[PDB]
Every structure is written in C-alpha cells, then in structure tokens.
Amino acid sequence: ITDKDHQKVILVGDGAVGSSYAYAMVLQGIAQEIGIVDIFKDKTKGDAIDLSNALPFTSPKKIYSAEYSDAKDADLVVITAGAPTRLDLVNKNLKILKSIVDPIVDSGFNGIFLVAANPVDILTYATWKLSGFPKNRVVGSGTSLDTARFRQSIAEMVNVDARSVHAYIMGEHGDTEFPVWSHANIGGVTIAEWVKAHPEIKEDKLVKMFEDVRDAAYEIIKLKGATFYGIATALARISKAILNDENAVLPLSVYMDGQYGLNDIYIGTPAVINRNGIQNILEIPLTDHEEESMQKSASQLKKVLTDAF
Amino acid sequence: ITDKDHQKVILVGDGAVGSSYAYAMVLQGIAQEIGIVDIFKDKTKGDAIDLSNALPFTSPKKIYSAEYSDAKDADLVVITAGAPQKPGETRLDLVNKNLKILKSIVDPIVDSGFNGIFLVAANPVDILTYATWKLSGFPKNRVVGSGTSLDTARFRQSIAEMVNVDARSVHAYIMGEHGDTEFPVWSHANIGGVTIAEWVKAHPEIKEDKLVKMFEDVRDAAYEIIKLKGATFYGIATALARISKAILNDENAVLPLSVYMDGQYGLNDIYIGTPAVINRNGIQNILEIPLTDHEEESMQKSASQLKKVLTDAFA
Amino acid sequence: ITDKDHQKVILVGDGAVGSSYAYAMVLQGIAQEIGIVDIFKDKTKGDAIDLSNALPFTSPKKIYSAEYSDAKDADLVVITAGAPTRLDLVNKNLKILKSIVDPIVDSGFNGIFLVAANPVDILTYATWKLSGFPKNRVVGSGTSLDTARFRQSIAEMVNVDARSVHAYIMGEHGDTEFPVWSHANIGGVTIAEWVKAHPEIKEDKLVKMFEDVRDAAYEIIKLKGATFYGIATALARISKAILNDENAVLPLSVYMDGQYGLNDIYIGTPAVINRNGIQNILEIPLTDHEEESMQKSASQLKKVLTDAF
Amino acid sequence: ITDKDHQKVILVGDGAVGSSYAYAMVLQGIAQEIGIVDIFKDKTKGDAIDLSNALPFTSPKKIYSAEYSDAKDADLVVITAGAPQKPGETRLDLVNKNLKILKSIVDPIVDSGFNGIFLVAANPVDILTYATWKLSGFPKNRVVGSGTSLDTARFRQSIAEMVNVDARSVHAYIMGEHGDTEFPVWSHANIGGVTIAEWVKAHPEIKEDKLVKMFEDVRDAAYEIIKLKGATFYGIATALARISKAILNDENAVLPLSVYMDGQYGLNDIYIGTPAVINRNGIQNILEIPLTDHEEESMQKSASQLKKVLTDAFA
C-alpha cells in the first residue's frame, strides 16, 4: 500500500512559469517526481539538471525531461503551455491544448488537471471538454494570483502580513475581474471598518489599488519583460493543497452549477480543494454592484466559449 | 552587526507547558538558544538534555538549565508556571499568591539588564500580563499575554471540523479575559470570507443551538481535556511558539493577545484579549473589531470583573 | 488515483513517547491522519483534542482515539506500547505485542510497522514473526536515538551543527551497543583526523562521551523522570523518510541476512529506507575491535530470542 | 534589543542568479528584507514586484529596488553579477574588468557604514572573493565566496543518482578554485559513512571509469547546462540561500566555501574552496581534509595557477 506514497507531477511547458513552478516545488519539497514536457527537448533536459543540482539542499526528487506518455501514473498534470482577436487567441490555444490533453488522456492519466495557460478560465473549460474528466478534477489557477497581488497590496498599505489579509479578486481572470470589497478584511475587520478607524486611507487609493492589480501583469512585463514568480508560487500552493489533502479555500477557476446565477462555465470564485480536487464552491453573497461585475465578467466569457465551440 | 543574528529565549517554568513549548521551538527551528529556568533544577537539566537529543533532526540550538541572570541579552522571556488555584481559594488569593512569585521572577530578570519582550502564559494570564507590566516598568507594547490565542484556535478548529475545511481558512475570535467571561465574535467570524451568518443561511441544517454549544465547548475545553488526560499543554505550547515566530521573524501578524486597553471597546488600564498586530517591537496596532450590542456587553462584563480584581490586587 | 494522497498513521501507545511523537507529526505537518490506540480511552480522547487544538497553526489532520480495526487502510503502524530477568521482560512484552499485532493484521493492515517499544530489536523481530510481513516492512527505531545522542555530543564538544557530524551507534540498542569510531567524522574529517588537528581533545573525553550515550536514558530519567523528546523526534524523522519516499540512510533495526556474519535477527545498522521500507542494508566495514563488539551484541541478543521462542 | 530581530540582505546583481536567489529566500522565509541593486533599475523594480506577489503564500518581507547606501544596516551583501568572459579575452583581462566593476560596488557599500558579511558568487568567485576582501578592508572570516558549494552539490547528486540514495546521505567534496582546476576528494567521499572505495568493493559493477567520468561531468556541468538551456542559475541560487541560512540562523554548519588560506594544504594568502564552519560571524574554522598525495597535488596546482593570476592582477 505504501507503494502509493510517491507523488508525481507532469508539467507541460518549460517557459519561465513552468520552470519557476518546478523550482518552487523543489525548494518546498512538494512531490517526489517532476516530469517536464516541452517541444524544446534540450531546454527541458538542461532545466531538469539545473533543478536537480538544487536537490542536495532540499528533499529528494526524480526530475526529468518527460513525454505525455509519462502522465500514465501522475497525480497532477500542470498546463502552462499558452500562446500569446480574443477569439483567434482562443482558437490557436485550443489546437495546442488538444495536442496536450489528448495524448495525456491516452497515457491513462487519471489524476487532476491544473491549468495556468492564458486565457485560463477558457482553457480550463476547454481542458474539461477535451479530457472528459469530472468537473471537480479540472482546476484553473483563475484569480489565485490576482487575489495574492490584491492581498499583498493591502498588506503594504497597512503594514500587516498578507497572511492576515483576506480579500478576493473574482470573475474571469483579465479586464472584467473585480474586487470583492464587501467581504475584504484585515484580521476580520472589513476594509469599510478599517477605513473608518484609519481615514488617511482615501477611497481613491483603494480604487487605484484594484486598478494596479488588474494592470499588474502589464506593469511587471514593462519593467522586467515577463511575470512568473507570482503564478509559480500560486501553482505550488494549489499543488500543496491537493497533495496534502488540505480542504483549503483558494480562489480558483471552477465549474458554475447555479452559483451567482451562472451555468456551464469555469470562472474565479473561492472553493475548497483537497486530494479529490474541488469539494465545495463558496458562493460569497455579493452586493448588487459586485453581482453585476460577476454577471458582466461571466456573460462576455460565455459568449467567447459559445463562439469558440 | 551579524553578532546580533542569534535569537535567545529564556523560558520560566519547565512544566508540561514550558517543556512542550521548548519542544515546539526545537522542531520548528525558532530561535538559536533556549535557557530553561525553574525552581526544580534537576528537571530543567533533564529537559535540556532530552530536547538537545532531538537537535540532530532539526536546526541547531544551545539548550540549557538557566538562571534569571541569563536573561541579560535575551530577546524573549516566556513566563509559564502559574501557581494553580487550590479548592476554596478566592480569585484574589490566586492573584496575590502569583504576584509574590511573579515579583521573584520579573525583578531579577529586569536586574540582569534584559531589554526584550515579555510573553506571559501563566494563569491567570490577563491579570499576570498586567502584573508583569507593573513589576517590569517595560512599555505596554513589550508585555504580551497569550490571552485568547488558544481559545481562538480551539474555536477555529471546531468550525473547521463542523464544515470540513482547513482551520487556516476559518477566521473567528474569542475575546475578553481568557476564562469563563470570554465570548465568541460571531458577527465577524467567517470561512474564506463567508460570515457564519451567511454560511448558516446557505446550510440551514446548521442549527443555532449547535453554534451555542460549540462556543460553550470552547469555553470549557480546558476542563474537558484536564478531566480526560489530566492536563492541557499542546495547544498553548503551539500558540506560544506561533507568537514567538511572529516576534522573532518580525511578521506584523494579527493574533488574538492580551494587550493594553487605551479606549478600545470603551476599556482603559487593563490587559485583555483582542486581535493585535505583533512584530519584533511587540504590539504595533490593537484591532478594535466593531462588536454587536450583545458582543460589546460581553466585552464590558469580562473587562469590568477583571478590572475589579486588578484594583483590589494592587493596594 | 489522488484518492490515495491521504497518509494515515495508527499509533499504539499514548504514553509520553507516543503523545510526543504525535505532537512532532502535528508540528512538522507529516501525514494527514493519526489514530491513537491505547487501553486508556479517556486519555487518548483528551490527547486527540489537545493535539487537534494545535492544528490551526500547522497543516490540517484528522486526529482521534482509535481501535486496532482502524489500521485497515493505514500506511504506518507505530508501536510504543512496551512494559518495563531480561527473558521475563521479553515474555511479558511478547504477550502484549501479540495482543497488538494480531488485531492489526486481522484489520487488513498492509503498510509498514515501525517498532519503538523496549526492548526494540527483540520486539522488532517478534513483530516480524507475529505479523507474517516481509522483513523490509518491519522496522525498529534501533540505534537511531543513540546515534542522534552521539552526534549531538560530538557537535557540542566541537561547536558544529550535528547535521555536519556523521557517527553511528550500532548493535542491539542497550548495554552491548558500540560506537563506530573508525568511520565517525565531522564534515568528512574522521574523529582520528580531527583529534590530530585538535589534540586538546583527549582519548578519555571520547571514551566518556560514548559511556554518557550508553547511560543517557538512566541520566535523563534520574533528572526529569522519563525520556521522550529524543525518540519522538527520531520516530517522526523515520516516518518522514517513509512517507516522502526519501531513500534516506538511517541507523535502524533491520533483518540480518549475512551482514557482519549475522543471520536471523533484527539489529542496529545504517539502512536505506523509502516508501517500501528497508531497501538496502549498509554493511560498514568494521575494525576487528568494532566487529567483535557487533558479534558480542548479536550473540547475546540471538540467545535471548532463541530462549523466548 | 528586539529592534535588531530584522534580517536585511542587499543583493547586487539582478540577473537569473540574483533573481533566482531572491526567489529561494522568499519561498524558504529567509530574512525579512531584500534590497536588489543593479544598473538596470527598471528590471529590479519589476523583480521586486514579481517576488512580492509571492509573499502571501510565505513569510512576509520588504522587497525593493535598492541603492548601495541601503547596505548601511544590512546583515548580508550578496554579490552576483560578474562581467562575463568575452571570446579571446585573457583570464587576467576578465579579472581586471571585474575589479573595476567590483570597486564601484564595494566602495559605496563600505561608505554606507555596512558592517555585515560579504557573500560573493560573481565569476571568477575565488579571485573576486579575495578582491572583495582587499577592497573592503573587512576581516578574512567576513568575506565568503560560494567557491565549490555548487560543484559539491552536483557531485553529491550524481553519486545519489548512481546509488539511489537521498543526496543528504551522500558526503563528498569538490575542492580547489571553482573552475577547470577543481578536483574531487574521493579519499573522504562516503555514503552514510561507507567510503566510495568501500562501496565500490561491495558493488564492483561500479567501474573506475564511471567514477572518472562522473567527476568530469561535474567539472563540465555548467558548460552542459548552458549548452542545453542557455544559462545556469537554480543550483547556485539554492547554494547561496543555504549559505545565507547558515549565517542568519547561526548554524555552525560545514559547507565548502572560498576561505582564506593561512597554511591549510600548504597554501597562503588566497581564497580557495574547502569545507569550513560558518555561523553569524562568518568563517569559524577551516577544515583541512588530509588529502592523498594525488589530491594534495591537485590542490597545489589549482592554488598556484590562481595565486599567479591574483599576483599579476594586484600591481
């Protein structure tokens, strides 16, 4: 039975995101095996060696340049392989995603898909459609990183550990996402309550703070050329919640079955995740304004999915 | 300047609590040195050896049987071993007994030149936190009690178990004086940001009387554990190690602690349990949760009963 | 397949060792479930609650007062339940051990046994005999703690992190165990080499240091009444080596199949351990003096086993 | 005194190495503050934001685009971005180029009042470690180079893979000047205390030529990784974070580092790779492994070639 006490991850895409993700899993000692799949075979071999060079300072792992067929007995397939009209972007990514998901399913893979490729909510739905897997075993990173960025920006404004800050970005990851100010809090004190006790914090600083979250990727790409440490860390956090069976609440792309009056899309909302994937979708009671933001995000996303399929 | 990158903790009290605390600090790699002070010198020497036997499986430390004078260059003095309430002793006698013992600890620690943070877990904690402040002459923000940290953990783990969620995704406080007068802040309690009131609307199989009972079981948790296994220690040891990490890693973490009231909740000149921000300099901000009328009344009744005992004890 | 990503430990014995072990597993986030089995049902219920009170500060776990029947789908059964002539001590512990192992096997348990009850090498062999399990899936703590004590004592003499100190105690845990000075080193510099560079270290300090290791339990019991933090920590280290599939070298009680000229006993030697238990028994080439110490430890232990069975 | 329980690292160089190093420090929770200094100011600002985006999943930090003057109260200055060898540049030109750049880093850092430890990873590391010592005026034991830390990890992981053992149970060194002249200490290399010579006797399917090749692959590892993926960074970033933890947690850990030779191996007045004990005060003890005649010759040839370049560079 202890023959099972070996956690295996297949990573698809060895760009800055996949490579950083593998490094995060090395340093935190999450899983015992990482197979790295990418068209660029030389690069994945180089990365597997560079990452392996770190292992003497952490817990051991088998790290290698892998093939889709190595997903047969994987716990976790992480898809980062995303090509940069919105509908053309989707059609291009659907053909690439089919070339990933089909051979992975053909391997006998029977674990959880974790999708981080842009656009994530659409490609999460597409992964579900192509794979034939249950809804709860296809997960997208959704607004996990936007939420982390939001919490860290509040943490810095108020000089508090972001782990004591509780706020969500929800909807489709992208321009239509929105902040759930109504439930956002610091140690259980709502932002509305916090602003009353600390009125140096102007409404316009909060507006700007959400705008900086929405435009974060643009600002980072402008400064250093790409974004990767954030999403790599989020993917490793989601990976730990699955592999350690945590029943952790994370904001993820999850299948709408009536939540917020939505159906038959993947979109960002807090959910409970454990070894079996999504257990519970948390439906935060939104204000009329927040519910409208959710409906506009959903509707625009549903239109693109319909047109794409 | 890196000569200072050595964190030192002086633990006063080598009971089940102090001992478990030191073990938590060993396994989590918090601090580089633990001096254990107790009247029972052989026991502290035995514990220092037993704890040291663990070190080859974790980060290294100097662990030893210590004296008050070893607090000179300590970052942290952790006070655990409160003289226990005898049958038919008044609360005020319990306090007076603990004040004479506490004076015999705090005075020689201050005399050593100790200039760090006091972390008080001795029962009764809110009163002995105030007493440590009074005896030490230290600033308000450098005398901290464990307060409702454990009651809050117990409350969060109870909600976690009812709802099948990691307690790290559950956010609820017990506040007031640690003891019979403490109360749950249901108004701000939430699971991943969904208030308990909101959660109960979506899941109405959860009856009001299960929630009432759940707070009652938290209030009476120590009595239930003492009845079953004779003593309580893993909970408070873990809480003390969490507070110790928040200080020593300068986290600005929000934790429910005994902190000095300067108008918060309409209270003054007591230590009592409420969320606060804590870093390397101790208490940075006291969070004043806007309480319902019922929750504010519970806070006032806890505070007033505690203030009466302190007043009577100092005179 | 991710239905398997749930590690379960059944602990037998909720005395200071078992209870400290469970606490170590809580603080280090090892396994997702601990069942605590003991005659004293009230005490195990109290301990499961006290340990659960810690969980909000660490990774989640299911911790409960358990029955032998709960071992059915356990990864790991840890036996600490040991009653304090040597042959009478063994006969008393064999009847108690039979009352543990039989109902655990009857449950359908199909994991690894980790034995810490005194006397450990004898009860490790007895666990193998009673269980019918393969040799490599019955492991004793053996000289893991004596070895830790030895390394920490060298660490303190020389002011070096014990993790940079490499020395073994081997043989039967107890009076006949011996230090392997021939291979003992600090950062790869043998103790013989270290003493040449640092001749303030007298041979008689080294003799005393092994004597203090052999008598460590006596000295600690005299001072504080019992010994538990050491073995609790060692048991949690061995548990991590199994559950994270490390192929770690640890000094353990393992089955002699010709190593050191020994057969058909469990005795202390370094071994490789992973998710499947013992993979490789390291046979350290001993000096004539060290080999004699091993043979005398083995022979006295083999006589007691023969007489007991 | 707890005002000091704030560990600060100034990183010089925000290339793949510096950036990966800062990420390793974020994920492992080492230090409370990282200032990133590089000529490319936009890149450091972008990195500080990207790294900060990770913080809600780990322990908190202040991460920012920094200047040399921010080293004033730093514990640790980590120097990574060495000007790379151009095709047909001499070794001595590489050194002279790096000395002018290194002077422009070390002088303003010393001028800030910085009084911590220098940790040098810039190529060529043993030479720039000596140069940092010469430019800074700091004591020998407070200027440390990464030396053969990564070569040693690569060597241990290669043995781990041959034998199917956790590399943490494998104990082998590469020593000398990091680069083509470095050598394996086979004589003291072991797996759980069993020397490689002993292991090969018990497992004679392991051929001498596989061991020769295994050291050759370690020596040429960087060339092989650069050929395959264009650059090397996870290895050295992880090593730098391990050395950083040994200093900041005062571990007295044995690591293979660039340390000042004062008679060890018959060497004087160079930095070169050998195991040493390191704590909060830097280098405490240099371990002198008794080398075979062949291993000692390799050490002498590595040292002498390195000493010639240093002599020529300083004059």
Written description of the protein model:
- 4 copies of one chain form a homotetramer.
- The first copy, chain A, has helices at 16-28, 41-52, 86-106, 120-131, 144-158, 191-197, 203-214, 216-224, 229-243, 288-308; strands at residues 8-12, 33-37, 62-65, 76-79, 112-115, 138-140, 165-166, 169-170, 178-179, 185-186, 189-190, 248-257, 263-274, 277-281.
- Chain A is globular and about 55 Å long.
- Chain A contains 10 helices and 14 strands.
- Chain A has 2 domains: 2-140, NAD(P)-binding Rossmann-like Domain (Rossmann fold, 3-Layer(aba) Sandwich), CATH 3.40.50.720; 143-308, L-2-Hydroxyisocaproate Dehydrogenase, Chain A, domain 2 (Alpha-Beta Complex).
- With 309 residues, the first copy, chain A, is α/β, with parallel strands linked by helices.
- In chain A, a hairpin with a 2-residue loop joins strand 10 and strand 11 (189-190).
- Chains in contact: A-B, A-C, A-D, B-C, B-D, C-D.
The major sheet of chain A is characterized as:
6 strands, parallel
Distance between the termini of chain A: 43 Å
Task: Decide which structural class fits the backbone of chain A.
Answer: alpha/beta
| Total count of strands of chain A | 14
Identify the most extensive interface between protein chains.
A-D, 51 and 52 residues
CATH topological fold name of the largest domain in chain A: L-2-Hydroxyisocaproate Dehydrogenase, Chain A, domain 2
Count of separate DSSP helical elements of chain A: 10
The CATH architecture of the largest domain in chain A is Alpha-Beta Complex
Tally of separate domains of chain A:
2
Oligomeric state: homotetramer
Biggest sheet strand line-up of chain A: 3-2-1-4-5-6
Q: What form of chain A results from the Cα inertia axes?
A: globular
What's the CATH class of the largest domain in chain A, please? Alpha Beta
Report helical residue fraction of chain A. Answer: 40-55%
The proportion of residues in beta strands of chain A is 15-25%
CATH H-level superfamily of the largest domain in chain A: Lactate dehydrogenase/glycoside hydrolase, family 4, C-terminal
Strand/helix succession of chain A: EHEHEEHEHEHEEEEEHHHHEEEH
Radius of gyration from the alpha-carbon trace of chain A, in angstroms? 19 Å
